[PDB]
Structure 1
Amino acid sequence: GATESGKRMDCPALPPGWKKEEVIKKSGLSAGKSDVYYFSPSGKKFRSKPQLARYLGNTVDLSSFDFRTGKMMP
């Protein structure tokens, strides 16, 4: 489910077609930690909440959006 890594998965808190993936760092000082990425319906990758907000504009309110989990967490 939602806490699987290495798996592209729907993010139901975002508009239709958005997906999320958690990538485990393979090497270096933070090996084993993770980065979370989002993918637009067109497949473009997004790496931060401000980046999502710039792109989505007023079609979403990301104020309570938790980037790491992909859930709204007021």
Structure 2
Amino acid sequence: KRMDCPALPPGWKKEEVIRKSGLSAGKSDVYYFSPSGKKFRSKPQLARYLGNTVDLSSFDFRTGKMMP
């Protein structure tokens, strides 16, 4: 399920999807959803949308935490 990510602005949720098939079966991808449902797949994609709203330079994309 999509769980709230406190490091990001209110309404931002993150979800982790285990791959089901193929040679990378078992690995996982992380996605974020904006307050309005829009899907982000990488830290630079989040960065382009959020801009000056929050400094994502210490943001660990995979876990959803600022790692100082």
TM-score of the pair, normalised by structure 1: 0.90
Match of 2:58 among 46, 64, 67: 64
Deviations 1:30-57 (A, max 9, x none): 1011000000000000000000000001
How do 1:1-74 residues align onto structure 2 when only pairs under 5 Å count? Answer: 7-74=1-68
Q: Percent identity?
A: 99
CA RMSD of aligned residues (A): 0.4
Corresponding pairs, count? 68
Unaligned runs of 5+ in 2: none
Report the TM-score, using the length of structure 2 for normalisation: 0.98
Instruction: Give structure 1 stretches of 5+ with no counterpart.
Output: 1-6
